[PDB]
Design a protein around this ligand. Structure first.
Ligand SMILES: [Ca+2]
Length: 220
């Protein structure tokens, strides 16, 4: 996260860290058994770390659970990152408490201008922002017009842009797979963008609201 602020500890209880030796992607707990992330973060097996704030220090609130199944969206394409969404099933159900809570799936697609929160342990591109502590940032959803204007012919129905064309505030590598929450619902998944926080290059996110059927069917 670039240009944000440190999240208050445990203020984003749905935020998870996908670990394979080290943190490599974020994710969102949607229920006691499933986690949503980005398809490009795929690995046959991964360790989901919940209840984290500082990923390098044991705080006593963490729950480390290995995956039992990792399912990429059937239409995911590594050529253009289309349909960049994935589901991870926990081998054992997560214990919901003060530090671990699921985020609700969208009941409708959020319109442009809606304010959201994006968080993660990715690159901060700062000397004062410690990436080991969960970082937070508020970003508005952009119109398709602005999105396509920034990335001509690269935006599909499964993508949306969020952030500021002015630059300076944006998600970045390491935040990938993480949540974009607006009005208490998971509207996006950190996917891609040109550089980070660069003017004219907003962040691109997987449009969760059009995957409700696949998500609910797969979680059955
Ligand atoms: Ca920790």
């Amino acid at each position: 996260i670039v240009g944000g602020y440190e999240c208050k500890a445990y203020s984003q209880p749905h935020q998870v860290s996908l670990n394979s030796g080290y943190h490599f992607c974020g994710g969102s707990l949607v229920n006691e058994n499933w986690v949503v992330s980005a398809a490009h973060c795929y690995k046959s097996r991964v360790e989901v770390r919940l209840g984290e704030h500082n990923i390098k220090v044991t705080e006593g609130s963490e729950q480390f659970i290995s995956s039992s199944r990792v399912i990429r969206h059937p239409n995911y394409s590594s050529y253009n990152i289309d349909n960049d969404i994935m589901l991870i099933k926990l081998s054992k159900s997560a214990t919901l408490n003060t530090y671990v809570q699921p985020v609700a799936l969208p009941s409708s697609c959020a319109p442009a201008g809606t304010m959201c929160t994006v968080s993660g342990w990715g690159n901060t591109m700062s000397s004062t922002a410690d990436k080991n502590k969960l970082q937070c940032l508020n970003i508005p959803i952009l119109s398709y017009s602005d999105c396509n204007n920034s990335y001509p012919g690269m935006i599909t129905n499964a993508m949306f842009c969020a952030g500021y064309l002015e630059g300076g505030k944006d998600s970045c590598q390491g935040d990938s797979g993480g949540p974009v929450v607006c009005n208490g619902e998971l509207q996006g998944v950190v996917s891609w963008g040109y550089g980070c926080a660069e003017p004219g290059n907003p962040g691109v996110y997987a449009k969760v609201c059009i995957f409700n059927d696949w998500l609910t069917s797969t979680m059955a």
